[PDB]
Amino acid sequence: SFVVIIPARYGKPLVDINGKPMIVHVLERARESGAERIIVATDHEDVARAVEAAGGEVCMTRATERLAEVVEKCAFSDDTVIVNVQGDEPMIPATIIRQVADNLAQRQVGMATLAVPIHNAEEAFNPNAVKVVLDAEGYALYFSRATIPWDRDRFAEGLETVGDNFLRHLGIYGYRAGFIRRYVNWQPSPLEHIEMLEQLRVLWYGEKIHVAVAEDLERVRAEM
Amino acid sequence: SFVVIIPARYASTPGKPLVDINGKPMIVHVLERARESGAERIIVATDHEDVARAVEAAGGEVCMTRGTERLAEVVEKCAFSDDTVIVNVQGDEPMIPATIIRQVADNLAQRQVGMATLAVPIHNAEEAFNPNAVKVVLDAEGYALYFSRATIPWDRDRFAEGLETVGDNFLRHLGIYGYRAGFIRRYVNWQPSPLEHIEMLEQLRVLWYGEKIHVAVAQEVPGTGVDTPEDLERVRAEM
Amino acid sequence: SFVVIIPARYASTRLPGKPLVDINGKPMIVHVLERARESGAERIIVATDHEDVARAVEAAGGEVCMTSGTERLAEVVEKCAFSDDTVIVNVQGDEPMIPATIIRQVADNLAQRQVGMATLAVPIHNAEEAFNPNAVKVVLDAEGYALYFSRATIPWDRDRFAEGLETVGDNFLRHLGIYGYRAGFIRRYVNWQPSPLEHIEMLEQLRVLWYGEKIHVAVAQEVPGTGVDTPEDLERVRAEM
Amino acid sequence: SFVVIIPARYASTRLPGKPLVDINGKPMIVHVLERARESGAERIIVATDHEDVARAVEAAGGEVCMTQSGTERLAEVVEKCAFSDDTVIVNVQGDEPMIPATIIRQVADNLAQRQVGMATLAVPIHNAEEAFNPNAVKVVLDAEGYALYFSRATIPWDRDRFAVGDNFLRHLGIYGYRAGFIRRYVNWQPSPLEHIEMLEQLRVLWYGEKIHVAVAQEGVDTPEDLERVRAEM
């Protein structure tokens, strides 16, 4: 029992992939997941019409904090499990959306994300690839654009190679409507502005984040 | 009430613990600092008997050992209560301001947490980008979120094109710790975490086992430790 | 701002055409509509599948929605296309004397809590009711949220019942069937796969608790007279008004 | 990773000196101490107010903490040891020497995995005797397995069939808590409901916290029991 809200800023939402707009592919993924309700949050009528054409529900928003807007308009109860799922991943498997919802429900954490192993040095050293370090229980310690965990010895010698310990954070956030409300009631944290990672506000205010281990010119076109 | 344990290291590119600094060995200067802090008991952990005699002659206490396992052998040998707060202070810091030794003790005394430590602001970008300087990122209450040799937190916009300059938010972690005797035993009992060996950072084991570490900005910025002859003159001249 | 929906069941073994039964000059359904107007509801909708009921209600200026209890409410929520944040209070058409004030209360309670549902309860003073499976007991947390609803006697007073079951304390609460919920919730509740607990106790509010949602419960501000399905109940009510 | 505390209940109307009862060559509590060792606990403390039990436990290389609610007794051990708030404690009774070591570990895993305050266990009830027995605590879980309520009353109530079945869960007396949750627990004011049901865990539910209940279809107070256990071990 969960709801999917897809934040689509805006021109990425409508970029074509294979006869469908980027956003439509994510709605199909959200829909394949079993979600009871699939809302696309937009600030544009070009997007709101593409999704509307598609038979997908739409909530207009100003131009996670966008999800707080939707949560308020739909008046969701604090207990409603919400899975973010960004509009930038049109091929995200329908099962990791479920995984994220289920993990959040199993546990009583405030936020549930997902990460994927990095098997590439270029990715590990890319400040656009967000890295996450985990404790033994899978809870996150930190999220950063820095290369963490820093492998001292191998990087003492070189940066053309990477071990098998890096985890790439994906933008699929599980959380309760009550948590989003709390999220936006907190004063923005200083750490979130330096890294430019919304996720850090939750760590700044002492909340935990469970992490399960599953933009530009693309090859996605080929992949699907 | 808190205890101070001073591990007197010897490893160094010479005869460190006993090196003279204006008439007294360096190890006795660290002892004086620990007394200044109000510790009710200062123990020097050493394996060399000549180091032992210098401490004893100064009226200090000594626990012959066989660098944190050293600490545990001392809590072992002294049968300290679990609740006993212990502050590990370095044998090569003759000028360690006593205020900070007290600061860690009190910080730890006040929180129901595993470890307590200190950090200092980083002003030079060289230091921010040097892996031998450990960086630490805090939560709204000073609990370490993470310790790293990578530059964290990552300044997105400022670092976008290389690393030339630095903001004012960076924190360099000081290797001065506080903990209960019970916690030192657990810590040392644990199986080494995968994380601590990747970063080569003992403190990561604490976070890995889902325990917390409280960090504070040192009340006074600590003079550097003494490991080179040029540091000795710096020290000797300074004291 | 809130909406009242009044399910009108024509059907009734011991009382045929019950919504239209005459009570001191007007049809029962109409009396319920009056109570609901007294509550301050902005919109009152009588849900019926009979044209005659609808005519009775329209004659007295009432709005009608031509249509499994909760499911029936969903049809109405559908056809009226209520907005999600719309507060609905379900009031039975068998209750011509339901105190207007408890209708307001459920709405007021729901209005400031982001809860799935809001309900009411009444103190149980006799041990017969406490031990009566037909009386549904509810046990609340410190903030008025239901821990559990049951036909069993809860909370169980272990030291007292070790002695005897012919007397109770002041810790018992009889659950009342008047509910408050937002239209967004109703239209979701209704597609949930029936909970296994639900079927054992034969309590459908157990579906909310089983899915991890909350049910706010407050002590009704007034004790409601019971419904009307018996011909004897009809004369009684006839006499009380 | 996790600590185990074994309250060595001494008194028993029918069984005097429980902890030191020989069960095939070893006192009852030592057997419990071995189950906790097999569990993988990193530390096992026996909570007792008797010198006999303290000597038996110590002779066996076990740790002892010489110690008004039961959960308050755990609290004394917690202050005595000075565990950090994050420390995971698993409370295991000294009168259950057959307690499989993996349910102990299971309770510990559940609490660690779930960021909840308390974790516990339950097993299916099969016969009507137990289901209608007020000393047999029934619990009713939600879809995610979190407790809805604990009662000495027969819940859930089978309307038609009671006017036994197959959806009844009996609560076990083993808990997983963090050290910070025992202090919070202990500082709260007693709830009005715990006293009516005479159930300590109801306090948790009255203050809005959650209780995770795991199910695993798998207690020595009387002489009958000593034999049922001796003659099974």
From Swiss-Prot, chain C:
Its EC number is 2.7.7.38. One of its GO terms (cellular component) is cytosol. It catalyses: 3-deoxy-alpha-D-manno-oct-2-ulosonate + CTP = CMP-3-deoxy-beta-D-manno-octulosonate + diphosphate. One of its GO terms (biological process) is keto-3-deoxy-D-manno-octulosonic acid biosynthetic process. Its main location: cytoplasm. It is found in: Cytoplasm. Activates KDO (a required 8-carbon sugar) for incorporation into bacterial lipopolysaccharide in Gram-negative bacteria. This is 3-deoxy-manno-octulosonate cytidylyltransferase. It comes from Escherichia coli (strain K12).
